[PDB]
């Protein structure tokens, strides 16, 4: 299992960037719904906690439903200015974070692709 371990960090960071991008897009979509509080994830803390760290039913038989077995602390963004509809989404910060997150997702893709390219180039002979 060394190929999984070597590529684990960048793949997990890429997945976290995709999740945070989904959250930021949800923030942008709800930009006008009253009473909405802007949310986000601390990337570094979540990444380290994922790297450091359900119960499916036992299909002993060969003829039964496999069934199902079925975690990021959402931190509230501190509001910049008060609004009467109680919407804490400041669009400038959200757009800056959206551009930053998209850029870092592309960088993670570039780094992971370079690692895979080097590993496949080593084996090519």
């Amino acid at each position: 299992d060394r190929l999984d371990a070597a590529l684990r960090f960048q793949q997990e960071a890429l997945n976290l960037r995709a999740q945070r991008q989904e959250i930021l897009a949800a923030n942008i979509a709800n930009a006008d719904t009253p009473g909405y509080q802007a949310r986000d994830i601390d990337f570094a803390s979540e990444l380290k906690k994922v790297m450091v760290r359900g119960v499916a039913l036992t299909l002993t038989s060969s003829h039964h439903i496999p069934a199902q077995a079925v975690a990021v602390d959402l931190l509230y963004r501190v509001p910049d200015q008060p609004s009467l509809d109680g919407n804490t989404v400041d669009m400038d910060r959200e757009r800056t974070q959206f551009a930053d997150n998209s850029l870092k997702y592309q960088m993670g893709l570039t780094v992971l692709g370079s690692q895979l390219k080097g590993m496949m180039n080593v084996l090519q002979g």
Partner: peptide, 16 residues
């Protein structure tokens, strides 16, 4: 959880 997104929620109103 939400309401009218615009003029009817960004104007001061007496309380209920």
């Amino acid at each position: 959880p939400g309401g009218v997104p615009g003029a009817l929620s960004n104007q001061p109103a007496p309380p209920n």
